[PDB]
Design a protein around this ligand. Structure first.
Ligand SMILES: CN(CCOc1ccc(C[C@H]2SC(=O)NC2=O)cc1)c1ccccn1
Ligand SMILES: [Zn+2]
Length: 258
């Protein structure tokens, strides 16, 4: 009886195994656009993905992860609210059963169809496992997806999903350029939070882009054909793999833009 997104093991149950689920800096949150404060001291975000080396795509039973070589400073996030250098380790998405839900963060209570998370770790902690034990260990760049025109740069991801349908399947996934998943603007909101799955560690500086990317209905329909289950188990469609908004508590969301 392990955690997941069902009636019996979903977010409302996670606190039993992971009491930090009720902590002081949990994610995601609703972004109240009128109460976020413009912070003119926030720097532009530096996204340096020119040298990114993708390796593999994995269905881990909760999402699919596109994994990168993080053994050198090749794909790094710097600037914005961050001190020092954060290495890209993986990206994944959260999405819904319906276009009207799927994002983890919300904007004035609006749910997007999906949310992309580019996960980066602070190089001053040496490895990802050490970084998650630190309050400034990770930087996650969150990007909303809305359904409209196709995202050309997403299609290579969409087309490999047939090969990783079930939990524990992986495939080669080299030479994927994550710059093709970014919107035009790097305007962002930022706040201190957590991993949005168990172990729910309070180690993340969240950077959520204001501008969504557009993906087509066909692209997100292919996400929804993935399975939570392993091969030869009853089919459970991988849909609604999002944690809902958590209490903001004693936090301020800052805007990089007026
Ligand atoms: C290091 N580790 C393994 C898991 O740590 C995680 C890091 C990120 C994620 C993905 C989350 S965070 C986000 O933005 N969206 C997600 O889905 C999940 C687990 C540990 C460390 C201690 C105990 C157990 N495992
Ligand atoms: Zn995530």
């Amino acid at each position: 009886h392990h955690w997941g997104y069902g009636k019996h093991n979903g977010p409302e149950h996670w606190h039993k195994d992971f009491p930090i689920a009720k902590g002081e800096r949990q994610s995601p949150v609703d972004i109240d656009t009128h109460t976020a404060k413009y912070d003119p001291s926030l720097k532009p975000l530096s996204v340096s993905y020119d040298q990114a080396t993708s390796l593999r795509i994995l269905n881990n039973g909760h999402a699919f992860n596109v994994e990168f070589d993080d053994s050198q400073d090749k794909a790094v996030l710097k600037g914005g609210p961050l001190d020092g250098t954060y290495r890209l380790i993986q990206f994944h998405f959260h999405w819904g059963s319906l276009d009207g839900q799927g994002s983890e963060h919300t904007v004035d209570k609006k749910k997007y169809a999906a949310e992309l998370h580019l996960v980066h770790w602070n190089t001053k902690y040496g490895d990802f496992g050490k970084a998650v034990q630190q309050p400034d260990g990770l930087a996650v760049l969150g990007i909303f997806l809305k359904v409209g025109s196709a995202k050309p740069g997403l299609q290579k991801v969409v087309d490999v999903l047939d090969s990783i349908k079930t939990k524990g399947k992986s495939a080669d996934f080299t030479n994927f350029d994550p710059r093709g998943l970014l919107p035009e603007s790097l305007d962002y909101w930022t706040y201190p939070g957590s991993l949005t799955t168990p172990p729910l560690l309070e180690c993340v500086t969240w950077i959520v882009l204001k501008e969504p990317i557009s993906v087509s209905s066909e692209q997100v329909l292919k996400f929804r054909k993935l399975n939570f289950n392993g091969e030869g188990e009853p089919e459970e469609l991988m849909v609604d793999n999002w944690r809902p908004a958590q209490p903001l508590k004693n936090r301020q969301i800052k805007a990089s833009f007026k």
